[PDB]
């Protein structure tokens, strides 16, 4: 009966992490406290269960600029009393497009979460994910 879902909006941040921030603003979703966005880093669930989890991530970069290796993004899960762990991951190869060329990334997948479970999107260089409206989002809905 109680729908549990959450769509949160990307939020840039001076902090130092490869873990992306999110804000409960704009046209977002947060059906209730049965799902809660804490620390602006992850989404935590209070009810065990199956959930469809996703994160849309577009970023803007350059071939040689950071060049290095690709730009991988990963949907991570951190269950209580368990070490972290990776659920999904997408990865593209920096375009040349100067100054930077955007590129998008998308990852879903159904999972079973233990009560207290909590997920977070993490990328290789947040200093370059794109935050224009509608670009980078993250969220989950329970079946």
């Amino acid at each position, epitope marked *: 009966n109680p729908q549990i879902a959450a769509h949160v909006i990307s*939020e*840039a*941040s*001076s902090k130092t992490t490869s873990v992306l*921030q999110w*804000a*409960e*603003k*704009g*046209y*977002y979703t*947060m059906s209730n406290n049965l799902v*809660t*966005l804490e620390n602006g880093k992850q989404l935590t669930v209070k009810r065990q269960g199956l959930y469809y989890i996703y994160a849309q991530v577009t970023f*803007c*970069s*350059n071939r040689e600029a950071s060049s290095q290796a690709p730009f991988i993004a990963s949907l991570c899960l951190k269950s209580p009393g368990r070490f972290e762990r990776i659920l999904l991951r997408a990865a593209n190869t920096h375009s040349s497009a*100067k*100054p*930077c060329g*955007q590129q998008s990334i998308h990852l879903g997948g159904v999972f079973e979460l233990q009560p207290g479970a909590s997920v977070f999107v993490n990328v290789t260089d947040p*200093s*370059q994910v*794109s*935050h*224009g*409206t509608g670009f980078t989002s993250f969220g989950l809905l329970k079946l």
Partner: antibody, heavy 118, light 112 residues
Framework: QVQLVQSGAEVVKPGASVKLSCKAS????????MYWVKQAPGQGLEWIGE????????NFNEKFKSKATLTVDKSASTAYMELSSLRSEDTAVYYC???????????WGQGTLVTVSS | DIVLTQSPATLSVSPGERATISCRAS??????????MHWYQQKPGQPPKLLIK???NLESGVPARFSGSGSGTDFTLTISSVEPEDFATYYC?????????FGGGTKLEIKR
């Protein structure tokens, strides 16, 4: 001290184009989105756009998508605004300011008076 | 675009008088943990100076008289007891979405 030093005032004839610059300092340049705000005589504060300097990536207020062109010189820790095809109502003071997590805009350049007249 | 309406447009207070301006969102801009509202004071000739961010936290350096509250669509900013320097004009501004947009402004005039 964290400071942003905007360029000198500009007087320009309609239809021309001007390229405003803003030199940040006192902090890590690439770690802040640099915004731009226009304030016209009597007219209020208007947000033009945003530029991540690390990136080159930008985002404009639709209402100005045509007038502005945000760009930055990561190396020189500087951002630049290029207003083009200036009508007369384009006259005002253009402020470059450091957004703090793209929310509160916490530091501003002196401002640049762009006055466009024949 | 969200539209913020401040009020009064002019608030005439004397030094030693407490003053509180109010802002207004055409829509809620405060969610479950934060209210994306900020206030600036701006003097003639100068650019705005950030005083309060996220509806109620003093920016670094702002003096304690300055304070702010509110949520959803209404917010206030209030100096506990006006001081000469305080006379200026104030803008409230959100950050709920693109484009951020500023309120009309309120001048904090000197009663006399």
């Amino acid at each position: 001290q964290v400071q942003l030093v905007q360029s000198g005032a500009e007087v320009v004839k309609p239809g021309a184009s001007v390229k405003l610059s803003c030199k940040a300092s006192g902090y890590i340049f690439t770690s802040y989105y640099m915004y731009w705000v226009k304030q016209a005589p009597g007219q209020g504060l208007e947000w033009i756009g945003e530029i991540n300097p690390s990136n080159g990536d930008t985002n404009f207020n639709e209402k100005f998508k045509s007038k502005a062109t945000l760009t930055v010189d990561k190396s020189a820790s500087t951002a630049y605004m290029e207003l083009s095809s200036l009508r007369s109502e384009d006259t005002a003071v253009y402020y470059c300011t450091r957004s703090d997590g793209r929310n509160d805009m916490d530091s501003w350049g002196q401002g640049t008076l762009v006055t466009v007249s024949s | 675009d969200i539209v913020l309406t401040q009020s009064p447009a002019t608030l005439s207070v004397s030094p030693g008088e407490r003053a509180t301006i109010s802002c207004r969102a055409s829509q809620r801009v405060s969610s479950s943990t934060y209210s994306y509202m900020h206030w600036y004071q701006q003097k003639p000739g100068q650019p705005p100076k950030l005083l309060i961010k996220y509806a109620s936290n003093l920016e670094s350096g702002v003096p304690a008289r300055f304070s702010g509250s509110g949520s959803g669509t209404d917010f206030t900013l209030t100096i506990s007891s006006v001081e000469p320097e305080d006379f200026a004009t104030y803008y409230c501004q959100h950050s709920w979405e693109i484009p951020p947009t500023f309120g009309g402004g309120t001048k904090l005039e000197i009663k006399r």
